[PDB]
Amino acid sequence: SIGAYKQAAEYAADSKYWALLAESKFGTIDDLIAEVERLYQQGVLMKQDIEDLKQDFKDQDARLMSLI
Amino acid sequence: VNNVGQFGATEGSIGAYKQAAEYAADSKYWALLAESKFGTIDDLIAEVERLYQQGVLMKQDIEDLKQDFKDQDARLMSLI
Amino acid sequence: IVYNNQAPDAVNNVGQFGATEGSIGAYKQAAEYAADSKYWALLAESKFGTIDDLIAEVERLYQQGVLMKQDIEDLKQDFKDQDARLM
Amino acid sequence: RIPPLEKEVYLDIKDGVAYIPPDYLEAQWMMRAKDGTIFQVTSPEEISYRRQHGNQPVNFARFGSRFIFYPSIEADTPYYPDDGSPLIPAENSVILSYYADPPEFHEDTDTSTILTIAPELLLYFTLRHACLFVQDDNGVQKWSALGKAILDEMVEQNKKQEYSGSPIAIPNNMTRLQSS
Amino acid sequence: SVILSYYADPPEFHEDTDTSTILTIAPELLLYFTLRHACLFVQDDNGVQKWSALGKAILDEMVEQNKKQEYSGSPIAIPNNMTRLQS
Amino acid sequence: RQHGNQPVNFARFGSRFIFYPSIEADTPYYPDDGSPLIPAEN
């Protein structure tokens, strides 16, 4: 498991080979982060809703205890 | 300062830089790490996205059911 | 005492190993591409950490929240139903 | 070859492919930073023989622009774009001492140990090429002789500096340690 | 695979911007050795002698430098024992 | 170190004296208040 010693230009060209794959995997991760941001927006909306419901239920249970 | 003393100092070198092969190896290592992460965590994120999408659909559906049942029983008890 | 991690800046005007005026560009381009690859890897690691942590944490949080909320709501509904049927 | 132009640095072996740094001119003592151990240099054929035929001693050679080692060494060093981070050198960290090629002057404010230790040397060795540029031979010969004398003085000083604290007498070493 | 390490001959310049490791390491070498043939073209003997002596000294320094980086950092005693597998 | 009343040995590793027995040394009292250096033990 031993290779030859290429010239500097060959090693340079070999180094740049590790860029396109990353560029594509990021062109995908951008859409991924957009999707998870949409999910977080839906989650914060549902949390606001659950909070409104929780407060309304606190008030309704207080009213119930007051009446009976 | 030293006059003739050889240990009184030490002149630097051209530059503490490696060969192109070491830079290529470092790039390849970083790329393999990033690619393994990409692949594995992307499969995981896709599976989790499918699972959580189905879960939140079921959740909002059952929430509609619960809310309609709640208001139905509420008005039913109000009418009594 | 030190490491050879600095970047290429000059050529070996004396020395039978290393770089030359016709090869220093290759060294510098390789260093730049390696630094860019490391930047990409770190950005991907940060993105994946953010995604995983945030998703898992918020999922568990609101899942336990809605679970306990539904449990208490169904229990209160059952109690109310039994009290209604009693009268 | 003198101390002030030397340089110590850790290496990354990677069991073979380990490469020679650009500033390599001549290797001094080579060892580790854990309990101490000195390597000895041998030829490619010896290492090729060791590979098949077969760990106290450790050898190495010079394959073009590489430093080969028979045992599968796993020396570790921080990668290139690392920011600072001395890293608290881990174990199995070999430390190489060699003679590094000094930098070339590029600014009037740029100084070097040679200027502060022996400027007449540079002045004579450059007046040589100056008197060559123009047509002159007596000055060339005189400046060359003076520069050579200065260099001889400096190398003789370096010689009298090494192993210069006591005499030596080999105490009939016949490997007292054989059990292991 | 089989690897071979040989002393390759470099290509002729045939261009101004072209360069080589020698121009960076020992330009004085080529300078003096070409001024030798120049002062041979024109009948100049003393110049030929001077340039040839200087080039010879430079080449001697180079070959000596290539020798002091060889298998030096070790004793020359204790001849190796690469005998056989039969002890 | 590997194969090892007690003689001492030292070398020169570029810019560092390396003693085998791992001897310990100390510097004397620094004070410049017109007082002696008071050499140190060991």
Side-chain angles (χ1 to χ4, degrees):
Chain A
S1 45
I2 309 181
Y5 197 107
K6 311 171 199 166
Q7 304 303 337
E10 283 151 313
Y11 282 110
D14 294 2
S15 297
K16 178 157 67 180
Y17 169 59
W18 314 105
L20 287 64
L21 60 97
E23 288 173 355
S24 46
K25 296 156 178 295
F26 286 113
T28 303
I29 205 170
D30 56 12
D31 188 349
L32 282 170
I33 183 165
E35 181 274 342
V36 68
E37 182 69 330
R38 192 282 324 286
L39 200 45
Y40 165 71
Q41 277 293 330
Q42 179 272 338
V44 302
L45 171 141
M46 185 57 231
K47 287 296 296 184
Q48 262 292 310
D49 181 292
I50 213 167
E51 210 277 350
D52 308 302
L53 263 69
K54 191 178 74 173
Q55 296 302 329
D56 309 327
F57 299 163
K58 288 181 211 309
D59 311 328
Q60 93 192 3
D61 292 358
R63 176 277 314 161
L64 202 160
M65 299 316 120
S66 63
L67 183 141
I68 181 171
Chain B
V1 64
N2 58 88
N3 198 13
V4 193
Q6 287 180 346
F7 301 153
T10 186
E11 61 186 355
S13 159
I14 303 302
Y17 64 101
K18 322 178 179 183
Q19 282 68 235
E22 292 289 348
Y23 298 170
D26 290 1
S27 176
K28 166 178 171 89
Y29 171 72
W30 286 121
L32 284 163
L33 188 150
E35 182 281 348
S36 68
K37 267 182 174 56
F38 269 120
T40 58
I41 312 165
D42 180 88
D43 187 318
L44 170 141
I45 284 163
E47 182 280 349
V48 161
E49 182 281 299
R50 299 292 307 114
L51 179 59
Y52 292 5
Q53 210 280 346
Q54 302 320 281
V56 297
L57 291 196
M58 176 282 316
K59 180 55 57 173
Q60 57 85 10
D61 298 311
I62 190 167
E63 280 167 352
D64 310 301
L65 316 185
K66 189 64 170 183
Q67 293 317 312
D68 56 55
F69 183 24
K70 185 73 219 71
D71 51 63
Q72 290 148 27
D73 60 57
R75 54 218 199 200
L76 171 141
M77 305 269 170
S78 315
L79 171 141
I80 197 154
Chain C
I1 189 179
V2 286
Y3 296 87
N4 279 10
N5 50 13
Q6 304 302 327
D9 205 338
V11 300
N12 293 11
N13 281 85
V14 51
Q16 296 174 353
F17 310 79
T20 67
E21 289 282 356
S23 172
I24 193 72
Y27 287 64
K28 299 208 289 185
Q29 287 185 131
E32 294 162 7
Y33 299 149
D36 296 0
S37 65
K38 181 193 173 185
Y39 151 76
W40 285 129
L42 259 70
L43 183 64
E45 158 54 16
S46 88
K47 285 288 205 306
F48 284 127
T50 294
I51 286 163
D52 187 329
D53 284 327
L54 187 150
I55 291 185
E57 172 271 310
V58 301
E59 188 82 9
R60 176 276 314 162
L61 182 138
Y62 69 71
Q63 275 285 14
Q64 309 334 291
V66 304
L67 264 296
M68 60 76 58
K69 196 193 182 196
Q70 289 289 126
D71 308 327
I72 61 161
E73 280 176 345
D74 307 311
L75 268 290
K76 173 256 200 161
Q77 286 267 263
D78 308 311
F79 309 145
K80 184 171 59 160
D81 300 348
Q82 310 330 315
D83 309 328
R85 300 303 94 58
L86 173 142
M87 300 285 206
Chain D
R1 298 286 180 266
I2 54 177
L5 58 93
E6 289 182 4
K7 179 184 174 182
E8 316 185 38
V9 67
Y10 304 86
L11 286 176
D12 52 288
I13 306 285
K14 302 297 196 305
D15 63 277
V17 285
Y19 304 83
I20 308 176
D23 54 0
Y24 183 76
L25 305 178
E26 174 178 354
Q28 272 197 347
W29 53 266
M30 186 174 183
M31 61 187 290
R32 281 186 156 178
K34 182 209 77 181
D35 264 345
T37 294
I38 294 280
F39 307 87
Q40 65 169 2
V41 61
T42 44
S43 42
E45 288 78 1
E46 177 65 8
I47 293 169
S48 186
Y49 155 79
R50 275 281 284 277
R51 288 275 186 79
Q52 45 206 49
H53 291 248
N55 65 287
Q56 278 289 321
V58 183
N59 302 324
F60 67 107
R62 197 264 298 168
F63 286 32
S65 292
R66 303 192 202 82
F67 266 115
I68 298 281
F69 295 74
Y70 152 76
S72 177
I73 303 296
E74 284 300 81
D76 213 317
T77 56
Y79 301 108
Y80 169 76
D82 69 326
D83 62 308
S85 315
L87 204 73
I88 305 102
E91 321 313 337
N92 64 57
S93 189
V94 307
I95 185 161
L96 181 83
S97 182
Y98 61 82
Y99 295 93
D101 48 357
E104 289 210 324
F105 290 113
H106 193 48
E107 293 178 356
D108 296 0
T109 62
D110 198 337
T111 192
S112 185
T113 183
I114 305 305
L115 277 297
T116 74
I117 195 183
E120 55 267 11
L121 185 148
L122 297 160
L123 189 149
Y124 301 167
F125 277 152
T126 193
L127 279 176
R128 178 185 195 194
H129 297 281
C131 301
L132 285 175
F133 176 86
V134 73
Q135 297 73 12
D136 200 63
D137 57 356
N138 197 320
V140 167
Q141 301 160 4
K142 294 292 103 187
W143 295 126
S144 307
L146 288 159
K148 222 186 285 292
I150 302 275
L151 196 141
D152 283 8
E153 279 178 359
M154 290 163 62
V155 301
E156 194 74 2
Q157 151 170 295
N158 188 0
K159 284 163 60 57
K160 301 211 297 298
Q161 162 268 318
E162 220 176 347
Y163 314 96
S164 59
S166 160
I168 306 164
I170 307 315
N172 262 299
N173 277 115
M174 195 65 107
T175 182
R176 304 281 87 192
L177 82 175
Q178 281 166 199
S179 289
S180 87
Chain E
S1 190
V2 302
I3 295 171
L4 185 144
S5 194
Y6 65 98
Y7 291 93
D9 66 329
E12 305 173 4
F13 288 114
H14 200 293
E15 177 59 19
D16 300 330
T17 184
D18 201 329
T19 178
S20 179
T21 192
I22 297 288
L23 262 55
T24 78
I25 289 163
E28 56 190 325
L29 180 70
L30 298 175
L31 178 63
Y32 301 157
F33 269 105
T34 190
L35 278 157
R36 181 202 195 192
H37 296 281
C39 300
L40 280 181
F41 209 61
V42 63
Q43 286 95 22
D44 189 14
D45 313 288
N46 55 15
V48 168
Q49 301 165 11
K50 295 289 101 177
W51 297 128
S52 306
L54 298 157
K56 179 70 189 307
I58 296 285
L59 192 139
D60 292 324
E61 286 189 358
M62 293 267 272
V63 300
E64 291 155 41
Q65 178 181 339
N66 194 7
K67 280 164 57 54
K68 300 196 294 186
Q69 78 93 36
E70 304 298 331
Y71 320 89
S72 76
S74 159
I76 190 54
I78 313 185
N80 57 7
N81 268 296
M82 58 180 183
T83 62
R84 287 188 297 274
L85 271 173
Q86 201 166 90
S87 176
Chain F
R1 207 185 327 291
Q2 310 176 198
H3 283 217
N5 264 347
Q6 50 197 91
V8 192
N9 305 108
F10 68 97
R12 196 264 296 172
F13 282 33
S15 181
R16 296 177 298 282
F17 287 141
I18 300 283
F19 299 66
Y20 159 69
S22 87
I23 58 163
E24 304 295 71
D26 313 278
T27 51
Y29 267 126
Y30 304 100
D32 304 318
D33 60 89
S35 298
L37 298 200
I38 305 162
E41 188 60 22
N42 279 6

mmCIF file of all heavy atoms in Angstrom, chain D residues 8 29 31 35 56 161 177, chain F residues 1-3 12-14 16:
data_model
loop_
_atom_site.group_PDB
_atom_site.id
_atom_site.type_symbol
_atom_site.label_atom_id
_atom_site.label_comp_id
_atom_site.label_asym_id
_atom_site.label_seq_id
_atom_site.Cartn_x
_atom_site.Cartn_y
_atom_site.Cartn_z
ATOM 1 N N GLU D 8 13.947 21.987 15.000
ATOM 2 C CA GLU D 8 13.269 20.790 15.471
ATOM 3 C C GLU D 8 11.782 20.898 15.165
ATOM 4 O O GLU D 8 11.207 21.990 15.207
ATOM 5 C CB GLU D 8 13.478 20.593 16.973
ATOM 6 C CG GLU D 8 14.905 20.820 17.436
ATOM 7 C CD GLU D 8 15.101 20.490 18.903
ATOM 8 O OE1 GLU D 8 14.502 19.502 19.375
ATOM 9 O OE2 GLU D 8 15.852 21.218 19.583
ATOM 10 N N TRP D 29 20.055 14.179 15.228
ATOM 11 C CA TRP D 29 19.398 13.164 16.038
ATOM 12 C C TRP D 29 17.897 13.151 15.785
ATOM 13 O O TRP D 29 17.259 14.199 15.659
ATOM 14 C CB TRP D 29 19.672 13.423 17.518
ATOM 15 C CG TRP D 29 19.333 14.813 17.950
ATOM 16 C CD1 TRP D 29 20.178 15.880 18.015
ATOM 17 C CD2 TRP D 29 18.053 15.288 18.378
ATOM 18 N NE1 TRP D 29 19.505 16.992 18.457
ATOM 19 C CE2 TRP D 29 18.197 16.654 18.688
ATOM 20 C CE3 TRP D 29 16.801 14.691 18.532
ATOM 21 C CZ2 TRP D 29 17.135 17.431 19.141
ATOM 22 C CZ3 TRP D 29 15.748 15.464 18.981
ATOM 23 C CH2 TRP D 29 15.921 16.818 19.280
ATOM 24 N N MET D 31 14.326 11.193 17.276
ATOM 25 C CA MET D 31 13.861 10.467 18.450
ATOM 26 C C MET D 31 12.394 10.797 18.691
ATOM 27 O O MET D 31 11.736 11.437 17.864
ATOM 28 C CB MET D 31 14.716 10.810 19.672
ATOM 29 C CG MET D 31 14.675 12.280 20.050
ATOM 30 S SD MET D 31 15.840 12.704 21.357
ATOM 31 C CE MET D 31 15.083 11.876 22.749
ATOM 32 N N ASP D 35 9.895 8.677 26.829
ATOM 33 C CA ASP D 35 10.873 7.748 27.389
ATOM 34 C C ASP D 35 12.178 7.724 26.599
ATOM 35 O O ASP D 35 13.138 7.066 27.011
ATOM 36 C CB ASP D 35 10.294 6.329 27.466
ATOM 37 C CG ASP D 35 9.721 5.998 28.836
ATOM 38 O OD1 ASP D 35 10.003 6.733 29.806
ATOM 39 O OD2 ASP D 35 8.986 4.994 28.942
ATOM 40 N N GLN D 56 12.453 -3.473 19.669
ATOM 41 C CA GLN D 56 13.196 -2.447 20.400
ATOM 42 C C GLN D 56 13.817 -1.433 19.449
ATOM 43 O O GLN D 56 13.517 -0.232 19.566
ATOM 44 C CB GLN D 56 14.241 -3.105 21.306
ATOM 45 C CG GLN D 56 13.687 -3.604 22.632
ATOM 46 C CD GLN D 56 13.313 -2.479 23.576
ATOM 47 O OE1 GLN D 56 14.013 -1.470 23.666
ATOM 48 N NE2 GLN D 56 12.204 -2.646 24.286
ATOM 49 N N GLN D 161 33.132 22.696 20.057
ATOM 50 C CA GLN D 161 31.986 22.859 20.941
ATOM 51 C C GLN D 161 31.334 21.526 21.283
ATOM 52 O O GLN D 161 30.822 21.361 22.395
ATOM 53 C CB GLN D 161 30.960 23.795 20.298
ATOM 54 C CG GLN D 161 29.559 23.710 20.888
ATOM 55 C CD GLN D 161 28.672 22.720 20.160
ATOM 56 O OE1 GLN D 161 28.673 22.654 18.931
ATOM 57 N NE2 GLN D 161 27.907 21.946 20.918
ATOM 58 N N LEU D 177 22.837 -5.662 29.579
ATOM 59 C CA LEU D 177 21.401 -5.950 29.543
ATOM 60 C C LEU D 177 21.146 -6.917 28.388
ATOM 61 O O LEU D 177 21.190 -6.546 27.215
ATOM 62 C CB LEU D 177 20.591 -4.659 29.418
ATOM 63 C CG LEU D 177 20.392 -4.005 28.045
ATOM 64 C CD1 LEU D 177 19.456 -2.810 28.142
ATOM 65 C CD2 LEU D 177 21.722 -3.587 27.444
ATOM 66 N N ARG F 1 18.696 4.424 29.512
ATOM 67 C CA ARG F 1 17.340 4.377 30.046
ATOM 68 C C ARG F 1 16.713 3.007 29.823
ATOM 69 O O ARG F 1 16.106 2.432 30.735
ATOM 70 C CB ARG F 1 16.492 5.473 29.405
ATOM 71 C CG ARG F 1 15.344 5.939 30.281
ATOM 72 C CD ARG F 1 14.451 6.947 29.577
ATOM 73 N NE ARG F 1 15.185 7.795 28.644
ATOM 74 C CZ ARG F 1 16.066 8.722 29.007
ATOM 75 N NH1 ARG F 1 16.339 8.923 30.289
ATOM 76 N NH2 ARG F 1 16.681 9.447 28.084
ATOM 77 N N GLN F 2 16.851 2.465 28.613
ATOM 78 C CA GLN F 2 16.334 1.128 28.346
ATOM 79 C C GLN F 2 17.028 0.090 29.218
ATOM 80 O O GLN F 2 16.380 -0.587 30.026
ATOM 81 C CB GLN F 2 16.503 0.792 26.865
ATOM 82 C CG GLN F 2 15.980 1.872 25.931
ATOM 83 C CD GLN F 2 16.250 1.568 24.471
ATOM 84 O OE1 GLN F 2 16.197 2.456 23.621
ATOM 85 N NE2 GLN F 2 16.545 0.309 24.173
ATOM 86 N N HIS F 3 18.341 -0.046 29.073
ATOM 87 C CA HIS F 3 19.120 -1.020 29.839
ATOM 88 C C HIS F 3 19.789 -0.347 31.037
ATOM 89 O O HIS F 3 21.012 -0.254 31.137
ATOM 90 C CB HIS F 3 20.151 -1.694 28.938
ATOM 91 C CG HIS F 3 19.573 -2.741 28.039
ATOM 92 N ND1 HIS F 3 20.241 -3.906 27.728
ATOM 93 C CD2 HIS F 3 18.390 -2.800 27.382
ATOM 94 C CE1 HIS F 3 19.494 -4.638 26.919
ATOM 95 N NE2 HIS F 3 18.367 -3.988 26.694
ATOM 96 N N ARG F 12 23.788 16.873 24.310
ATOM 97 C CA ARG F 12 23.363 18.168 23.782
ATOM 98 C C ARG F 12 22.365 17.914 22.656
ATOM 99 O O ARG F 12 22.755 17.553 21.542
ATOM 100 C CB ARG F 12 24.559 18.977 23.295
ATOM 101 C CG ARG F 12 24.273 20.456 23.102
ATOM 102 C CD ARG F 12 23.929 20.782 21.660
ATOM 103 N NE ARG F 12 25.044 20.524 20.754
ATOM 104 C CZ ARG F 12 24.957 20.584 19.431
ATOM 105 N NH1 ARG F 12 23.807 20.896 18.848
ATOM 106 N NH2 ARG F 12 26.022 20.330 18.685
ATOM 107 N N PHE F 13 21.082 18.104 22.951
ATOM 108 C CA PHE F 13 20.017 17.877 21.977
ATOM 109 C C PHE F 13 19.629 19.203 21.326
ATOM 110 O O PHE F 13 18.525 19.722 21.487
ATOM 111 C CB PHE F 13 18.818 17.213 22.648
ATOM 112 C CG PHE F 13 18.989 15.741 22.889
ATOM 113 C CD1 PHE F 13 20.233 15.204 23.168
ATOM 114 C CD2 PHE F 13 17.898 14.895 22.837
ATOM 115 C CE1 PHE F 13 20.382 13.851 23.391
ATOM 116 C CE2 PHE F 13 18.044 13.541 23.057
ATOM 117 C CZ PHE F 13 19.288 13.021 23.336
ATOM 118 N N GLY F 14 20.580 19.752 20.574
ATOM 119 C CA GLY F 14 20.366 21.020 19.907
ATOM 120 C C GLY F 14 20.625 22.203 20.815
ATOM 121 O O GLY F 14 21.625 22.909 20.658
ATOM 122 N N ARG F 16 19.565 21.838 24.450
ATOM 123 C CA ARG F 16 19.110 21.328 25.736
ATOM 124 C C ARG F 16 20.069 20.257 26.223
ATOM 125 O O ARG F 16 20.316 19.276 25.514
ATOM 126 C CB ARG F 16 17.695 20.750 25.630
ATOM 127 C CG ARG F 16 16.628 21.764 25.266
ATOM 128 C CD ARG F 16 15.265 21.107 25.116
ATOM 129 N NE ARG F 16 15.243 20.123 24.038
ATOM 130 C CZ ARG F 16 15.153 20.427 22.746
ATOM 131 N NH1 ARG F 16 15.078 21.694 22.357
ATOM 132 N NH2 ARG F 16 15.139 19.462 21.838
#
